[PDB]
């Protein structure tokens with residue numbers, strides 16, 4: 001670089017897009033508005049003589065039917081038009097077979113990076129560990145890292161001959177590889193690891209904070225993160241704001257001289273970190289999260305951002321094709337799946353069993369529960385479409401699971417069994433049997449076996465219930481909890497599709513649970 005020259009560099013970032021290429025029902029987010037905003041920032045920076053780098057923390061896949069049904073093609077093509085420079089591979093990039101991820105790499109004009117994903121049989125990285133960018137005469141390296149919980153959580157599929165090594169350790173190796181070969185002026189890490197207050201990752205794999213602390217001080221200008229899906233705006237040292245409000249100041253985290261940022265999820269914000277580089281020193285001069293048409297129970301927090309027409313023309317066919325696909329038969333059933341309010345809030349039903357079977361299958365759970373009030377429609381005997389599934393599960397809840405001890409299972413089920421019939425809180429159970437008497441659960445069994453307080457059990461449910469919905473005991477603040485990011489409707493639809501034709505007699509309750 002030129003000695004004593006001051007380079008202005010703006011790093012824009014997003015993460016955990018999860019199929020949100022289109023604006024939502026209230027006109028929020030979407031890539032068309034994102035495109036207008038990013039184009040505008042590039043124009044602003046170009047006029048000031050600076051440079052722009054746009055990075056993604058990953059998890060482009062999974063979360064919106066129109067995207068999922070098309071393997072996120074609209075999302076990657078839209079990202080090409082917004083002009084992303086690089087993205088870290090997220091755990092949801094492995095929700096589809098490797099053939100699909102390789103197709104996404106072909107669609108994407110920017111590198112999908114990860115230094116710590118290895119082919120087991122050869123010990124060789126599967127993807128590129130970093131990408132180099134020339135901005136002015138500076139060399140900026142962006143390394144990519146992926147959480148090593150990827151193949152560990154839920155019910156793994158698609159990791160043939162693949163392993164995820166510890167990302168913090170890999171970062172150490174990569175930074176050294178880079179300094180010894182490329183000597184980049186600036187190194188930024190795009191990661192899909194998660195931000196945990198004060199590095200308190202609990203049962204989850206260590207994330208960004210612990211990594212920043214393990215690396216040499218200031219060895220990275222910043223970590224552009226994701227996975228945990230939070231706007232990283234600090235309220236106090238080592239404490240993220242709770243209920244961060246769009247349009248308000250956002251102080252990113254700084255750990256061991258390394259800035260750590262995250263822009264929540266779904267294209268809700270484009271983070272903007274403005275830096276000044278001079279003689280080796282990377283100094284952050286400003287940071288903000290720029291909302292993309294976010295609205296407060298329907299009014300804009302910041303100036304409306306128009307939707308770029310080129311993006312609308314590019315994405316519309318995908319939106320239309322995805323919507324039309326919702327009508328297509330995904331399966332069939334030989335009997336009515338009972339989801340009516342006056343049944344699901346009074347007794348166990350086959351729709352409850354089917355939904356819970358789908359959730360257990362996705363998460364590797366041993367048993368499951370959900371509120372009957374969460375079942376919103378029945379499905380008549382005959383053909384089933386995704387549209388039908390979305391009426392049964394319309395709230396967009398996320399499937400989650402908790403690993404708990406047998407004693408915790410006893411306490412949890414005992415508490416949930418207190419929710420009375422004729423209320424939305426009445427529980428639908430799967431793989432649970434007992435006779436409730438005087439507030440106690442007698443002969444409690446999981447999968448036909450008495451509960452062993454010394455054993456570990458995995459329970460699936462929805463985030464709504466796990467966070468205390470309907471007065472259920474909270475599980476989200478306990479170790480062993482995992483929010484999978486899979487939407488209830490997608491889990492049910494995919495399970496019906498691979499299980500069809502469904503013989504509903506398999507889901508008929510036979511008095512496993514009773515109250516008296």
Ligand SMILES: Nc1ncnc2c1ncn2[C@@H]1O[C@H](COP(=O)(O)OP(=O)(O)OP(=O)(O)O)[C@@H](O)[C@H]1O
Nearest residue numbers: 371372373374375395397423424425464465469470
């Ligand atoms: N966003 C949501 N996610 C999951 N479940 C939900 C959600 N919103 C509502 N429910 C479920 O619906 C129940 C409330 O039902 P509903 O909205 O039909 O009630 P209501 O018409 O106000 O009447 P009541 O108050 O008698 O239930 C809750 O107890 C809960 O189980």
Ligand SMILES: [Zn+2]
Nearest residue numbers: 016059227485
């Ligand atoms: Zn995610």
Ligand SMILES: [Zn+2]
Nearest residue numbers: 059090091227
């Ligand atoms: Zn993730």
